Amino acid sequence: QILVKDREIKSFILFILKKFQCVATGDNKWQLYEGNATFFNELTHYTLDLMEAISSYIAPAMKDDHYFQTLVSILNYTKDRYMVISILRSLSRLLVRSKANEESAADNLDHKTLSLIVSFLLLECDSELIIASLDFLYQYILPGSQRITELFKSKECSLILEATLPNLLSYNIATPDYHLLQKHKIRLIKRITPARQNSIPEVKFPQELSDVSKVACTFLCLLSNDTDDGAGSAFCQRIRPLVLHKLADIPPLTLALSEYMENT
């Protein structure tokens, strides 16, 4: 709180972020000399952490905000993971109190960046990255319906969401396996008792969800509450049967997807 009320620190953070953007986009103005790269490396990290914190106190970001542009450039460039997660948190915190109709920072998110974040959704071996992407998308489509339209305008984002969300519902919760049954063969028990064949093996059911599944459920519930005859509501209808399969396999999913099943 004391740091935010200081123009010098914020100006320094912005300066370092613009230098990082110049490194990321590959500008010919300022080219880092690799003999110094080490220093720069450490520098960048600290700056981003600072940004993350103060990102909560500049919450409504306007249209031509330099922080947002710098962060999206760095996000499209970097290969670090700590950096990607920090940038996603910082971006999701710069969209807290923003209107959909009013011109805001969310108009600086071209289809490339949204496609990149949904691609992050497409991964499987990183729960934290998936949760960060889902939190960002939740905060994105939260204030209104025009942002849902802008999100589903892109064909790639639409396809990836449609293929990913139902499978994210059953993410790491050990569904009942119907393959032991197909592999189990039926014979006669060797051996005065009458001849039984054998007992079909049992089938267990999961009793609790994972964090990724809970976040996906909340996202679907939020997405279902949009006005019909508009995108986002047609998405749920295109997605329903796979969700029905998932619900048949997981009861806590039926308890958790109540708002989704109400508005469908």
């Binding site: 909560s56 807290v96 109190r97």
Partner: peptide, 26 residues
């Protein structure tokens, strides 16, 4: 070590979500 969920961030998130839910109730 970073604090993943600050107090003010959580408070603002809850407040905004409650406000939007109340708007939808209207």
């Amino acid at each position: 070590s970073k604090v993943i969920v600050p107090q003010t961030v959580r408070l603002a998130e809850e407040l905004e979500r409650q406000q939007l839910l109340e708007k939808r109730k209207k």
